[PDB]
RNA sequence: GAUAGCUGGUUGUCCGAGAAAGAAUUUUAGUUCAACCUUAAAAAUACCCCAAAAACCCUAAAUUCCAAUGUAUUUUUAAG
RNA sequence: GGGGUGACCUCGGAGUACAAAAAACCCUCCGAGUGAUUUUAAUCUAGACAAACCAGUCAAAAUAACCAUAACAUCACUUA
């Protein structure tokens, strides 16, 4: 992670991680299942939806994640049609 | 650490050692028959009837009802083993055995079932029904005589009323016609209570069909104490139970307490508790007839509860508890997306402050 | 040297809800490599042995006799052997439900 | 012993449950102090002079 | 008000019948290992003695509800040779008739794979289904 | 339901018959919404759910189809019961 | 359990063997 | 392996000299428990340490009033290898409220009511 | 001002609490998670735990899960 | 048990590790890097096991097609 850059002195962001991974505006991250694609012929059914299920990342990851992306990222995103504008919010949080 | 056993061990009592010279069942029917009996014993270690509601295990159930009549034991047998001879001694029924083509006068076979045997299979459906425990609590009744009940449908149908029947309220919808073998030197009551049905509360029953002091036979010359109501079971709650008892009592009893008004349309009225009702006529009345069927709602428990009642119909349904949800996690590990769905209050979007 | 392969970890093979445990439906009470606890009232069976809960209550476990599946030859073949006052018995788990079935509740009174 | 197992089942209930419902509300009542005027207006005090 | 009208929304219904007629009972799901399948709400059990033959219909808890048995005298005067197929062909019948008196329709049947070829048991089976009493219990609502 | 006039005779008898289970006592024919949280909403089910019902009472090829799942059971009790029913003995 | 009395209580290999002068 | 220590009930049977031999009376047990720390539960397991510091005897030689429940009776055969036990003596019956403040614990086990009167 | 997982050094006082290692790793001279621990904040149960319960050829010390009781500790949230 | 030579590097079963779980050695022994056959074995979703993470495991209800009564593919220590 760049700190500090050289020309804005800013602080960049990874790219993998916005290719590979989805942020929620309640702080949670969404990934897919690694090896959801390979070798499809040798697992069995309820394997295969396992995999094809996504799945959420632990607290580390999450702030792993949040370290290694800007503030870009974790902004309020009003989508035409977003799948996930559902999930943006957490209700029923008793914490 | 070993412990001692708290009793004797299943197979502690065949010897291991020469185990050729025992005897072995080569049948699987003969194992699964030992098995069986051997699972009916009051084992001392944790069993599944203990955790499953043997209810109490045995019970000194008290009986309230005639006596079982005196008969020849040994007549009988020398009667029954002459009979039996005079059927072998035939050769055509030989060949019809013999040729699988032989019939049974079912007819003949429930009278005499009913005479003999009859009773103790009423009292055992009635105690699975749970009769005994609703009307009495602590004693189970043999059903002595017989009480043949049947609901008339119109000029040639007749639905009867047998031990566990389904009757629907629109042939129930009228008096009944009942039936006994009776001398003319005793007196009868007759009661129809419903078991289920009572709104407001769950431990007393209803009344539909009272009447008392009938000699012998001829019921409707017998004052009716409660005129006939026909069922009104709900439309949710179905499947109640209504239960006509037959009392045979000594005494011409008299009461002014348990007498109901012509119309008899008050449910306040119609509240009955058939414990108390046998604990204030004790001394006289004994229970010797019994005739249960069950009943759902049909459309006549509309009319019944408009114009009879003077009611609205009150409509129930079987709810089921909700899904049990896990605490919802601040960080949900490797969780479907579909985990934010399981405590959604509804279904809507909401727009906090834009 | 000689001998390889011996390193593998433990497949925590054993017994997750004891007795007298409140479960929930779908709660694995038990899994095993082969049968040891064998399932009786309201317990599924896993195609890996596993136990697992079908009904919301109180896990028990008893000692009951064993009567075998007839098509189960190994199985029939041992209960024919066996001599004549022999019973088998297994050590089952159980779900004791607790919560009833459903309620009557009064929608409307028209 | 005094008591036998069977005894003293349940024998002192109350006062444990109450013990702990003063813990928990000891445990609760955590909360910063309330911030008084004469907090701030002491501090004007350290130039108080001889007019 | 009209006094009548108190309902009490929280309707007991104490029939131990209530919810097995409405099919929405718990079943007994289980076993699964061990024979028969203790998933029912009633189940026919016929036991072939070598002098007479018994149909039971019990219940989930072990009681018997109704039974039909050859050691009766309403049968064993009616019938020569209480062991055969023509009495096992009749008991089924008279359990049939005494299942719709008590107004239980649906029963498990789970015979031996030896039971189920027999000529008795396949006559038995006949019977009962001629009478209105049907096999197959029907599936829980909501297993 | 009975002075509903901007619907046929033929129509209101037709749901007095079918839709009697939610028909008060006092002859108002009562239809209920409770999906959306929203009252609009919940008018437009109410109506479209009047919507329907008077279609299915009008249209006259209605073949009343009914399901076999939770029918087999009452038709096989039904049966049960006739098979007692069927005794004939004048009375009354 | 060992420690508990219901121990061998499915102990069954003691009834069958199945492994002249 | 070093584990916990299952003692037997034939450790905890009085026999009839025994309560000629510690003063007890063989026919009604004491009611409370005067229970003191003499040794360190430093060297000591864990559970050891944690029984005797929800016993209260955190503290060496301060003596404690405990019941005579099995409940209590339990932790303290638990830890009988560092606790001095004695039944607690009322020569002088129970402390009411005024005798609250001028009440001691004598070192024989004795609890006075009225100690150094005037 | 090359770079050093390597060595050496790293400057006032007092007080509070306070850690000896499971997994990956061209990795075992190092890191990153977990388990412990520190600092705040929400709560409620936390240890001790008698029965009863945990497999089939023989098997010890003892374990797991649990009321009561004796204590006040424990779990989550945010930084580490 | 210094490096070099030799041997090993991943997965499963038994003992070490006697009774919940876990538990190391260049510790003692078995094995795997697939075959054969047809019942060609789905979608969706409660709740759970296991686990640092990545991965691995089960599974009720509901849905389409077969008895209108099963579908977990089976066997080779089946675990790899
Ligand atoms: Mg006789
Ligand atoms: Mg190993
Ligand atoms: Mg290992
Ligand atoms: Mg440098
Ligand atoms: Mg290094
Ligand atoms: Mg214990
Ligand atoms: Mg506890
Ligand atoms: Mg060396
Ligand atoms: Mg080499
Ligand atoms: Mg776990
Ligand atoms: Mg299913």
Redesign the pocket.
Same mark, same amino acid.
């Given at each position: 992670v760049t700190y500090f850059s050289s020309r804005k002195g800013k602080r960049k962001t990874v790219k993998a991680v916005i290719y590979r991974f989805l942020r929620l505006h309640s702080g949670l991250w969404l990934r897919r299942?690694? /090896?959801y694609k390979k070798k499809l012929w040798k697992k069995?059914?309820?394997?295969?939806?396992?995999?094809?299920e996504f @799945?959420f990342?632990?607290? =580390?990851?999450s702030? +792993?994640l949040d370290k290694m992306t800007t503030s870009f990222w974790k902004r309020r995103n009003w989508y035409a049609d977003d799948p996930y504008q559902k999930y943006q919010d957490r209700t029923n949080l008793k @914490? | *650490?070993?412990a001692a056993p708290l009793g004797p061990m299943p197979n502690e009592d065949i010897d291991v050692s020469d185990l050729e010279r025992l005897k072995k069942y080569r049948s699987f029917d003969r194992y699964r028959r030992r098995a069986e009996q051997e699972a009916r014993k009051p084992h001392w270690?944790?069993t599944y009837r203990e955790h499953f509601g043997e209810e109490s295990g045995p019970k000194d159930r008290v009986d309230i009802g005639l006596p079982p009549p005196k008969v020849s034991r040994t007549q009988q047998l020398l009667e029954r083993k002459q009979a039996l001879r005079e059927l072998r001694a035939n050769v055509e029924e030989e060949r019809a055995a013999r040729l699988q083509t032989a019939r049974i006068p079912l007819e003949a076979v429930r009278a005499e079932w009913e005479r003999t045997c009859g009773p103790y299979h009423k009292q055992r459906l009635a105690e699975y029904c749970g009769l005994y425990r609703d009307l009495f609590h602590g004693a189970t009744f043999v059903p002595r005589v017989p009480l043949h009940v049947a609901y008339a449908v119109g000029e040639d149908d007749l639905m009867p009323v047998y031990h566990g029947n389904e009757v629907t309220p629109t042939e129930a919808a009228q008096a009944p016609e009942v039936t006994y073998e009776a001398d003319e030197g005793s007196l009868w009551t007759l009661l129809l209570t419903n078991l289920d049905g009572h709104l407001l509360e769950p431990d007393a029953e209803y009344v539909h069909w009272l009447v008392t002091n009938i000699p012998g036979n001829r019921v409707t010359e017998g004052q009716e104490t409660c005129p006939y109501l026909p069922p009104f079971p709900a439309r949710g709650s179905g499947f109640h139970r209504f239960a006509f008892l037959l009392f045979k009592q000594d005494k011409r009893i008299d009461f002014s307490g348990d007498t109901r008004p012509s119309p008899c349309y008050q449910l306040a009225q119609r509240t009955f508790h058939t414990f108390d009702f046998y604990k204030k006529h004790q001394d006289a009345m004994t229970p010797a007839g019994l005739a249960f069927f069950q009943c759902r709602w049909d459309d006549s428990v509309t009319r019944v509860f408009h114009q009879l009642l003077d009611m609205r119909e009150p409509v129930f349904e079987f709810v089921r508890p909700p &899904?049990?949800? &896990?605490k919802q996690?601040?960080?949900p590990? *490797?969780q &479907?997306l579909?985990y934010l769905?399981?405590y959604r209050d509804s279904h809507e979007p909401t727009y906090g402050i834009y | 040297?000689? $001998? +390889?392969?011996?390193?593998? &970890? /433990?497949? *925590?093979?054993?017994?997750?809800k004891?007795?007298? #445990?409140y479960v929930?439906?779908? $709660?694995?009470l038990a =899994?095993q490599? #082969?049968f040891?606890?064998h399932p009786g009232a309201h317990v599924?069976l896993?195609? $890996?042995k596993?136990l697992?809960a079908?009904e919301e209550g109180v896990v028990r476990?008893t000692?009951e006799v064993y009567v075998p599946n007839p098509s189960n030859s190994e199985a029939v073949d041992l209960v024919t052997r066996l001599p004549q006052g022999a019973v088998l018995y297994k =050590?089952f788990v159980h779900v004791v439900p607790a919560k009833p079935e459903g309620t009557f509740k009064l929608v409307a009174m028209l | 012993p005094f008591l036998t197992?069977e005894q003293?089942? /349940?024998?002192?209930?109350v006062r444990?449950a109450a013990?702990?419902q003063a +813990?928990?509300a000891a445990?609760?009542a955590?909360?910063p102090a309330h911030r008084r005027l004469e907090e701030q207006l002491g501090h004007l005090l350290v130039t108080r002079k001889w007019s | 008000p009209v006094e009548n009208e108190a309902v009490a929304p929280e309707f007991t219904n104490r029939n131990p019948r209530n919810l097995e007629l409405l099919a929405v009972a718990r079943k007994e799901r289980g076993w699964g290992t061990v024979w028969p399948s203790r998933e029912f709400w009633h189940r026919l059990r016929v036991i072939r003695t070598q002098h007479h033959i018994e149909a039971l219909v019990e219940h989930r808890n072990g009681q018997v509800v109704v039974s039909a048995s050859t050691r009766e005298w309403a049968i064993k005067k009616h019938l020569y040779s209480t062991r055969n197929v023509v009495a096992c062909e009749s008991v089924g019948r008279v359990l049939a008739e005494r299942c719709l008196e008590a107004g239980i329709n649906f029963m498990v049947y789970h015979p031996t794979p030896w039971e189920a070829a027999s000529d008795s048991i396949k006559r038995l089976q006949h019977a009962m289904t001629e009478g209105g009493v049907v +096999?197959?219990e029907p599936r829980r609502i909501?297993? | 339901l009975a002075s509903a006039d901007w619907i046929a005779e033929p129509v209101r008898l037709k749901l007095a018959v079918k839709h009697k289970n939610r028909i008060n006592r006092s002859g108002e024919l009562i239809l209920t919404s409770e999906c959306s949280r929203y009252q609009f909403r919940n008018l437009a089910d109410c109506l479209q759910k009047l919507r329907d019902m008077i279609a299915e009472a009008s249209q006259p090829a209605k073949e009343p189809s009914r399901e076999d799942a939770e029918l087999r059971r009452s038709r096989i009790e039904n049966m049960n019961r006739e098979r007692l029913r069927k005794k004939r003995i004048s009375s009354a | 359990?060992?420690?508990?009395? =219901?121990?061998?209580?499915?102990?069954?290999?003691?009834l069958v063997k199945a492994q002249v002068r | 392996?070093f584990?916990?220590? *299952?003692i037997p009930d034939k450790v905890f049977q009085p026999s009839p000299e025994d309560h000629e031999k510690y003063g007890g009376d063989p026919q009604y047990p004491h009611k409370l428990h005067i229970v003191t720390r003499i040794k360190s539960t430093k060297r000591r397991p864990y559970?050891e340490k944690?029984?005797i510091?929800?016993?209260?005897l955190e503290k060496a030689h301060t003596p404690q009033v405990?019941?005579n429940?099995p409940?209590?009776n339990?932790?303290l055969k @638990?830890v009988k290898h560092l606790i001095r036990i004695k039944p607690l003596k009322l020569p002088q019956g129970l402390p009411t409220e005024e005798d609250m403040a001028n009440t001691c614990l004598k070192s024989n086990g004795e609890l006075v009511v009225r100690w150094l009167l005037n």
């Open positions: 299942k690694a /090896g069995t059914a309820a394997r295969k939806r396992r995999l094809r @799945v990342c632990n607290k =580390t990851q702030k +792993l @914490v | *650490r070993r270690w944790r &899904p049990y949800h &896990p996690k601040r960080f590990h *490797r &479907p579909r769905d399981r | 040297s000689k $001998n +390889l392969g011996g390193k593998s &970890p /433990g497949k *925590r093979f054993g017994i997750k004891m007795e007298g #445990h929930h439906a779908g $709660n694995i =899994t490599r #082969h040891r606890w599924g896993g195609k $890996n596993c697992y079908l476990y000692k =050590t | 197992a003293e089942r /349940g024998h002192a209930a444990r013990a702990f +813990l928990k445990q609760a955590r909360f | +096999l197959r909501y297993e | - | 359990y060992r420690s508990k009395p =219901t121990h061998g209580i499915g102990r069954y290999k003691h | 392996k584990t916990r220590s *299952r559970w944690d029984i510091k929800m016993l209260g405990h019941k429940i409940s209590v339990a932790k @638990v």
